[PDB]
Structures are given as C-alpha cells and as structure tokens.
Design a protein around this ligand. Structure first.
Ligand SMILES: N=C(N)c1cc(-c2ccccc2)c(CNC(=O)c2cccc3c2OCC3)s1
Ligand SMILES: N=C(N)c1cc(-c2ccccc2)c(CNC(=O)c2cccc3c2OCC3)s1
Ligand SMILES: N=C(N)c1cc(-c2ccccc2)c(CNC(=O)c2cccc3c2OCC3)s1
Ligand SMILES: N=C(N)c1cc(-c2ccccc2)c(CNC(=O)c2cccc3c2OCC3)s1
Ligand SMILES: [Cl-]
Ligand SMILES: [Cl-]
Ligand SMILES: [Mg+2]
Ligand SMILES: [Mg+2]
Ligand SMILES: [Mg+2]
Ligand SMILES: [Mg+2]
Lengths: 5, 231, 231, 5
C-alpha cells in the first residue's frame, strides 16, 4: 500500500 | 491567452465540466486561465485549481516512477529509456513551474485571509516537493528546503488561525508529514507530526456539526493510514 | 516530424514504455511516427498502434458521452456546455481522421497478407464508427455506410483466410455486431452475428493448443457478454 | 453494464 497525500 | 479571451465565469464552469468528464488537463488549463484574470479565488475555485493540477501531475509522477524503475533495472539497452524518462520528467517540471508561477504571480501576495494564504503556501510546498521527487543535481537541496519553508509557514499560520479539525490544516499536516518521511529522510519527524495532528483533531471532534465531522474524519483517516504503514 | 528524426526501432521501444507508463497519447504519437517511416507493421506493432489509439479515443469518447448527457439535460445555462462538448468532439474527430489517414496513406494498400489487410479494415470500420457516434449532419449516413463497407470487406476476407477462432476475426465480429446494434439500428443483425460467431468459434476450439485456446475464449467471452445484455 | 468492444 502506498502512503497517502 | 490561450484562455485570455474567455470569461472568468465561463472558465470556472468549464473547469467543473472537465472534472465531470475526467479531462484534467483541460480542467487545469481552464483554472490557469481563471487565475490569470487577476482576481482572488474563492474556496471552491481554489479547490478546483488544486484538484486539476493534482490529477495532471499525479499522472506524470506515476509515469515517471514506472520509467525510473525500468531505467534503474536497465542499469543493474540504448538511450531510449533515459530519453523517455527525461521527456516525462521535463513535462512534469514544467507543470510544477507553471503552478509555482501562478502562486508567485500573484496568488500568494494577494491572499489576505489566513485560510487563503495557508491554502496557497501548502500548494507551494507540494509542488516544490514534486520537484524534489525528481531532482538529482545541485538544486535538490535548495528545492527541499524551499518546500520545508513553505510548509512550515503554512503550519505556523494554520495553528494560529484555524482549528485543529480544519480540513485544509489536516491536509497540510498530512503532506508535510509525507515530505518529512520520504523527501527529508526524517521519518520520526513524519510520525510525530501525523500523530500529534491526528490526536489534536480527535480531541476537537466534539465541537463539530455533522457535516464538519464528516469533513474532518475523512482526512484524519489518511493520517491513520500513514501511521499504520510507518509503524 | 515531429517523430521524423527518431529511429523506427526507438519509436517502437518508446511506445512499449509509454504503454507501461499508461501514457497513451505519447504511445499513439510514437506509433504514428513508426507508421510514417513507410514500412509495413508486424503483428505486435499493429497491436501497439491499435491499443494506443483505442485508449486515446476511448478517453475522448467517455468524456463526450458525459458532456452530451449534461448538454441534453440542459435542453430539457449559456453556451458553455455546447462549446466544451464541441471542443472535445472536434479533438475526437481529429484523432479519428488521423488514424483513418494512416490507414489510407498507406497501411491498407501496402498490406499484402490477408491477416494484415483484415486488421486495418477492421480499424477503418472502428474509426468511422467513432465518427458516427458523434455525427449529426449531412454526412452521418455516408459515415455509417463507410463503416459498414470496411467491416464487411474485412469479414469477407477473414472468412476465407482465417479460422473462426482467430482472435482478430473474433474482435472484428464483436465490433461489427456492436455497430449493427447501436449505430445502424439493426439489433437482430447484431444478435445474429454475435451468435453465429460465438457458435462457430466454439465448434473449432477442439483444434487449438493451450495458448490459442486462451486467446480465443478471451474474446468469445465478450461476445457472450453482449448477447447476455441484448437478449 | 456497457456492451463490450
Ligand atoms: N470540484 C471539487 N473537486 C471540489 C469542490 C469543493 C467545494 C468547496 C467549497 C464550496 C463548494 C465546493 C471541494 C472541497 N474539497 C473536498 O470536498 C475534498 C474532499 C476530500 C478530499 C479533499 C477535498 O479537497 C482536497 C482534498 S472539492
Ligand atoms: N472552515 C471549514 N471547515 C470549511 C469551510 C468550507 C467552505 C465551504 C463553502 C464556502 C466557503 C468555505 C469548506 C468546504 N470544504 C472543503 O474545503 C473540504 C471538505 C472536505 C474535505 C476537504 C476540504 O478541503 C480540503 C479537504 S470546509
Ligand atoms: N503491447 C500490447 N498491448 C500487445 C502486444 C501484442 C503482441 C502481439 C504479437 C506478438 C507480441 C505481442 C498483443 C496481442 N494482442 C493481445 O494480447 C490482446 C489481448 C486481449 C484483448 C485484445 C488483444 O489485442 C486487441 C484486443 S497486445
Ligand atoms: N494466428 C493467430 N492465432 C495469432 C498469431 C499471433 C502472432 C504472434 C506473434 C507473432 C505474429 C503473430 C497472435 C498474437 N496474439 C494476438 O494477436 C492476440 C492474442 C490474444 C487476443 C487477441 C489477439 O489479437 C487480438 C485479440 S494470435
Ligand atoms: Cl523521448
Ligand atoms: Cl471550450
Ligand atoms: Mg470579463
Ligand atoms: Mg532531467
Ligand atoms: Mg532509420
Ligand atoms: Mg461538431
């Protein structure tokens, strides 16, 4: 899972 | 030009149509035209500007990451992978320079309200951050410190002038935290910022209407997601 | 130009990189450049050309449908919805004209093999079909009949020269069937073509290797999906 | 569901 912005 | 002959209101209306059509390059061009009319932007209009360029640069960044991974494997085949990665990178840098140009001429200086100034300083941090993602040369350090300075000034204003549940304040903290984690090599700073931001928002949820509660908890979930990934 | 100075092999390589990056506009430009070198295209190269423009025009068509629905509701608010729908429509028509131009100059005439000629006539049908989707004036009928003629010549060749499981033959039949259903107002023709195509492929699956069986059943499923929707 | 091509 990719970190969120 | 090329949007100079279209009415401001028509540009805003067409930005909203382009968003529904998922035509984000058009949307960004229309909103650039609207900014260039020289009048301040409303909250909705600021959101339209931000969403448009986020999606444009998002596609470019995603492409760049794919090509950079291929390029790196190919260095573990001719100049083509590097050439095409450079092409995408240059287009990405141009979009970032365009956005930073709108902010400097003259959105930030004309933003009287704290809420408007925070919005634009946060965007300034984001687009220097996207430049930092691809920077490799002598200006990487200047770019990183410029992002930090923009984010920090936004944080300082947001803490004095906005409640800890304000969604623009929460989105600023989310992105400054990611900056710390993956740009500045400061993962403890990133974790500390995400945690304090989450907890301070939690403690003021009791003050919110049903609508504001939904706005705030939506962005708090993103902070939690990153803390979950990072610890 | 603008791809005239790049090597054919480099254009193909960059098309494949653009596909991995989901940069379909770049992919289509690279493949246009490759076609314009003047040499025949291989099967893989034909597939690259088709995938690139399918995705480009697909995004345009999806946007057009959104805007057309909004325009129609607004006729049940100023010129902006019509203007922006027209802008997207014009860009879409330009892409279709570009593809049809490549086919006419000179892919189709230089396609010696049946398999190559069928591939390009099918594309010709598709891009006249996309033009028909948005056509409203005096040329709608000419455009529809041109799509039918291209599809039918492709069908005639495919039936003589290709087995009923050939995936290009199946994709041709799938799209000609959709043409009949939603462009030509011939839903029984559409259903009859999808059914006969499906059944004739089913009866020759016994002749296929494991790899060819997978290729064929993938496209047969699309025929079944449309029959399910239509009956 | 939208027909497929
Ligand atoms: N057309 C648009 N996309 C928007 C119009 C308005 C708007 C503002 C004021 C008045 C009227 C409309 C928006 C307000 N932001 C959101 O809802 C939002 C929701 C989830 C996540 C994020 C969000 O912002 C950035 C990150 S976004
Ligand atoms: N002071 C506040 N709390 C807000 C005032 C207004 C406002 C509305 C109309 C006109 C003027 C201001 C808001 C509009 N919503 C947003 O911007 C928003 C909503 C959900 C999520 C996110 C958002 O932004 C980034 C992330 S939030
Ligand atoms: N880069 C690409 N996209 C392709 C390269 C090759 C290729 C051909 C020959 C030799 C080497 C590669 C492809 C062959 N088509 C498919 O697999 C395919 C699969 C599902 C559906 C469809 C397909 O075609 C149109 C509709 S597609
Ligand atoms: N005669 C055949 N049956 C094929 C020969 C070659 C071929 C391979 C390498 C070199 C030259 C030809 C094929 C490559 N696969 C495709 O094109 C394909 C595969 C799956 C699905 C679809 C496809 O096309 C449209 C839809 S299929
Ligand atoms: Cl390139
Ligand atoms: Cl327009
Ligand atoms: Mg005016
Ligand atoms: Mg560079
Ligand atoms: Mg050469
Ligand atoms: Mg028109």
């Amino acid at each position: 899972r990719r970190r969120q912005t | 030009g090329a949007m100079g002959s279209m009415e401001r209101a028509s540009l805003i209306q067409k930005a909203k149509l382009a968003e529904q059509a998922e035509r984000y390059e058009d949307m960004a061009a229309f909103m650039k035209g609207a900014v260039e009319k020289g009048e301040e932007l409303s909250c909705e209009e600021r959101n339209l500007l931000s969403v448009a360029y986020k999606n444009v640069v998002g596609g470019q960044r995603a492409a760049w990451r794919v090509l950079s991974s291929i390029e790196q494997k190919s260095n573990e085949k001719g100049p083509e992978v590097r050439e095409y990665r450079e092409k995408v990178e240059t287009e990405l840098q141009g979009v970032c320079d365009t956005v930073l140009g709108l902010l400097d001429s003259h959105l930030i200086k004309e933003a009287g309200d704290a809420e408007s100034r925070v919005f634009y300083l946060k965007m300034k941090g984001d687009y220097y951050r996207y430049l930092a993602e691809v920077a490799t040369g002598d200006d990487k350090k200047r770019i990183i410190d410029s992002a930090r300075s923009a984010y920090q000034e936004a944080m300082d204003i947001s803490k004095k002038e906005m409640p800890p549940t304000n969604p623009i304040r929460l989105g600023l903290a989310l992105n400054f935290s990611v900056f710390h984690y993956e740009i500045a090599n400061s993962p403890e700073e990133a974790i500390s910022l995400a945690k304090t931001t989450f907890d301070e928002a939690m403690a003021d949820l009791h003050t919110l209407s049903e609508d504001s509660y939904k706005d705030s908890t939506l962005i708090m979930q993103l902070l939690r997601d990153n803390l979950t990934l990072w610890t």
